[PDB]
Amino acid sequence: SGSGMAQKTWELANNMQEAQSIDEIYKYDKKQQQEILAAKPWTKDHHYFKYCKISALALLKMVMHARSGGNLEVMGLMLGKVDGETMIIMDSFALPVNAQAAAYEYMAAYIENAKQVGRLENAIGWYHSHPGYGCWLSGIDVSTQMLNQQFQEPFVAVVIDPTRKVNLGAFRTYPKGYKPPDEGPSEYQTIPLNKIEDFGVHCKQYYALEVSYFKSSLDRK
Ligand SMILES: CC(C)n1nc(C(F)F)cc1C(=O)Nc1ccc([C@H]2[C@@H](O)CCCc3cncn32)c(-c2ccccc2)c1
Ligand SMILES: [Zn+2]
């Protein structure tokens, strides 16, 4: 008696509670992110971030963009958030002259599209390709990333080599005059003879993050 109507109400409650849960999670993440962004712990610690988690969707798009330029470098922006000492990359868009108002109004639509599905994301970094020479930061890249870790902070620098298999680097520059300890050659990389000087010179002015990869519930399509 009322068995059929009970099933419908139970389905409806299940759906209504999912939406409410999604909204609660988004709101908790938003306030938790506004907390750290106002706190700015990365301004005091120079080895703060240690991990970089990249979504399979963001990697797909970045690698696709990287490949499309062939022998020529390519660049774009990355969407994500902070989670303690980890930089999470969830999505990315290619770049791209009056002004870069397009790069600013693209960014807003991505954040907004993600908000709908209850995803909290904002500009977390920039990516670019080194077709054939490896993952590291050129002298010009180190100047770029030092400025980014001043005006765009928190901001990560991703470098993809689409020619040579998973050849990606996630990096953070150290501040001007910061002398750190330890050794950082990590994984060996064969870079050309016409780049080794620029490499070796600047290879101490930044560090590598421990890259990890993930497939989200939404990134399964
Ligand atoms: C974060 C981005 C938008 N950005 N912000 C700021 C400013 F805030 F400082 C400044 C920037 C920014 O365009 N940097 C930049 C610097 C150098 C290159 C080229 C340059 O050397 C030429 C040799 C090849 C190269 C290998 N690695 C970097 N390059 C690029 C760049 C990379 C790929 C495609 C197009 C351009 C961007
Ligand atoms: Zn570069």
Residue numbers in the entry: 4 to 99, 107 to 174, 180 to 236
Task: Copy out sentences from the published article reporting this entry, exactly as the authors wrote them.
The human CSN consists of eight protein subunits (CSN1–8), of which CSN5 contains a JAMM Zn2+-metalloprotease motif that provides the catalytic centre to the complex. The reverse reaction, deneddylation, is catalysed by the COP9 signalosome262728 (CSN) and allows subsequent binding of factors that mediate the disassembly and remodelling of CRL complexes. Furthermore, elevated expression of CSN5 and other CSN subunits is found in a number of human tumours, often correlating with poor prognosis. These findings strongly qualify CSN5 as a potential drug target for anti-cancer therapy.
The final compound, CSN5i-3, inhibits CSN-catalysed Cul1 deneddylation with an IC50 value of 5.8 nM and shows a good pharmacokinetic profile. The higher binding affinity seems to be mainly driven by additional hydrophobic interactions with one additional putative hydrogen bond formed between the side chain of Thr154 and the hydrogen atom of the ligand's amide bond. Treatment of cells with CSN5i-3 resulted in the accumulation of neddylated Cul1, similar to the effect seen on CSN5 depletion by small interfering RNA (siRNA)31. Thus, CSN5i-3 is a potent and selective inhibitor of CSN-catalysed deneddylation of NEDD8-modified CRLs. In contrast, treatment with CSN5i-3 resulted in the quantitative accumulation of cullins in the neddylated, active state (shown for Cul1, -2, -3 and -4A) and led to the degradation of SRMs including Skp2, Fbxo22 and Fbxo30. CSN5i-3 is a potent, selective and orally available inhibitor of the proteolytic subunit CSN5 of the CSN complex. The CSN5 inhibitor interferes with the UPS in a unique manner by enforcing the auto-inactivation of only a subset of CRLs. To the best of our knowledge, CSN5i-3 is the first potent inhibitor described for the CSN and is the first example of an inhibitor of a JAMM domain-containing DUB enzyme.
